[PDB]
Ligand binder design. Structure first.
Ligand SMILES: Nc1ncnc2c1ncn2[C@@H]1O[C@H](COP(=O)(O)OP(=O)(O)OP(=O)(O)O)[C@@H](O)[C@H]1O
Ligand SMILES: [Mg+2]
Ligand SMILES: [Mg+2]
Length: 485
């Protein structure tokens, strides 16, 4: 029960398909098609150690119905509490089906998870993402057919307003975060409903209550993410975010495994060691050369399916770390995203700008695929991010800026929240090679940024638009080809 029933999928709904090639690593399992050409056909990609059964559910309520879900749901007890009585669902896909029978598409306004799901009921097709669209979902829609996939590359081989076109691709759209698309298969018409939106108002609370609420929310979100009877792995940098996560996860599991990644030009091993000794975790340090780091370029764009150089450059270390892990497939928790709702980049005591940036960030995260599970599952590992849990996120986003920047410290309420579970050093510690290789390739700097965009854009074209494996891509030539422009 350590890994989701499924990591992703390629599904097809025909009112009247070739095998997929994912970036996600694992077994492929085609689900049965009882209604033949009038059902939901799908290929699930999952860990070889997991039967994908809980990722699929069927019913006859309303119509013949088939649901497929990638990922998992965290507020399970709560969702079960609203269901009519007794035979509990076997998996998350069946739970969704039960919820749909009671609330219809509004069921998704209730779910706090890390998932993407496609369900066909009759000639109606629903496509839904979690509140932050942390598990990307893409689609191609035409009168009579709907294809949906957790990877745009699987569709690479009709317009849809309310959904954004995937760069480079043609006719492929990414389903918005926190949304559910209701598509009538017969006409190809879709109506999209948003099921979550960042709060714009701010909450006032004294330090004491603010600090307790933040600790409790994080503890709960982490507990919901750790499998009972299994010690999880936390990618730890010694920063407060990841350390906050590690402290909660240790308490939740009873013990903890951690790992820190460094390069030949820098690392945070010292900072991380302070936490590993304090919590007494089983630690591992990994150092990868800068040259090997930059080699990840095609892999990061291929896995995230992003064309934004700032996102790609940011995901390089994590991609390298996930691919550098040795041993069995792990369930990994990260401290990713805490800086967004908390204004981690804010450097002044003056509060105004903290809210401006915060509001902008929350209004522009969709589409960046920054926390896509493919980042880690490409190496067979599952990652989940407690700070972007819906309840934790809502809470942090809502807090008045004065609780985020307080006593001259950044992200004050989180530091205070973890003050009794980590070394003071860790709690008090206040918060590129890619530019280089470009500069070393005859590229002056006003242009270097646009070069990174052209490099990334090209890799994407080859790996996601074309169909080339990152390994079959010579990054140096791509950089050169762009540099000479
Ligand atoms: N080299 C690395 N080793 C281990 N984990 C890492 C590494 N780089 C990134 N991560 C993970 O990615 C996330 C990105 O975070 P970030 O640079 O913001 O530091 P942090 O641990 O979050 O704390 P802080 O933001 O205050 O520095 C972290 O939460 C961390 O879990
Ligand atoms: Mg950090
Ligand atoms: Mg951080």
């Amino acid at each position: 029960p350590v890994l989701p029933a499924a990591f992703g999928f390629l599904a097809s709904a025909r009112t009247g398909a070739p095998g997929p090639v994912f970036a996600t690593r694992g077994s492929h399992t085609d689900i049965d098609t009882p209604q033949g050409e009038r059902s939901l056909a799908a290929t699930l990609v999952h860990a070889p150690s997991v039967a994908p059964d809980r990722a699929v559910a069927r019913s006859l309520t309303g119509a013949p119905t088939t649901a497929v879900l990638a990922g998992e749901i965290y507020n399970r007890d709560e969702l079960l509490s609203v269901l009519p009585a007794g035979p509990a669902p076997e998996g998350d896909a069946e739970l969704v089906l039960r919820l749909l029978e009671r609330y219809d598409l509004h069921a998704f306004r209730l779910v706090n998870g890390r998932f993407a799901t496609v369900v066909r009921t009759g000639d109606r097709v629903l496509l839904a993402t979690d509140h932050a669209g942390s598990v990307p979902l893409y689609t191609c829609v035409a009168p009579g057919e709907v294809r949906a996939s957790t990877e745009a590359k699987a569709l690479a081989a009709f317009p849809l307003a309310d959904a954004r076109r995937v760069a480079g691709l043609t006719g492929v759209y990414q389903v918005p975060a926190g949304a559910v698309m209701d598509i009538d298969l017969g006409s190809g018409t879709a109506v999209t409903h948003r099921t979550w939106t960042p709060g714009l108002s701010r909450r006032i609370l004294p330090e004491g209550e603010a600090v307790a609420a933040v600790r409790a929310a994080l503890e709960k979100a982490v507990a919901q993410r750790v499998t009972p009877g299994d010690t999880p792995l936390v990618v730890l940098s010694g920063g407060i975010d990841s350390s906050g996560v590690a402290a909660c996860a240790h308490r939740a599991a009873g013990e903890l495994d951690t790992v820190s990644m460094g390069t030949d030009t820098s690392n945070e091993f010292r900072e991380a060691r302070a936490v590993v000794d304090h919590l007494r975790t089983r630690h591992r340090e990994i150092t990868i050369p800068t040259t090997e780091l930059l080699a990840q370029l095609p892999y990061a764009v291929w896995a995230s399916e992003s064309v934004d150089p700032d996102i790609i450059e940011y995901l390089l270390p994590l991609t390298a770390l996930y691919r550098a892990l040795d041993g069995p497939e792990r369930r990994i928790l990260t401290g990713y995203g805490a800086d967004i709702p908390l204004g981690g980049m804010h450097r002044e005591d003056r509060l105004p700008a903290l809210d401006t940036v915060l509001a902008h960030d929350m209004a522009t995260f969709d589409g960046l695929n920054e926390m896509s599970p493919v980042l880690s599952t490409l190496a067979g590992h599952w990652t989940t991010h407690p700070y972007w849990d819906r309840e934790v996120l809502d809470l942090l986003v809502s807090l008045e800026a004065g609780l985020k920047r307080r006593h001259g410290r950044d992200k004050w309420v989180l530091r205070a929240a973890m003050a009794d579970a980590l070394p003071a050093e860790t709690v008090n510690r206040p918060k590129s090679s890619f530019s280089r290789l470009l500069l070393d390739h005859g590229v002056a700097e006003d242009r270097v940024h646009e070069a990174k965009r052209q490099v990334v854009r090209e890799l994407f074209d080859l790996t996601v638009g074309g169909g080339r494996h990152p390994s079959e891509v010579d990054t140096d030539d791509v950089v050169r080809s762009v540099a000479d422009r």
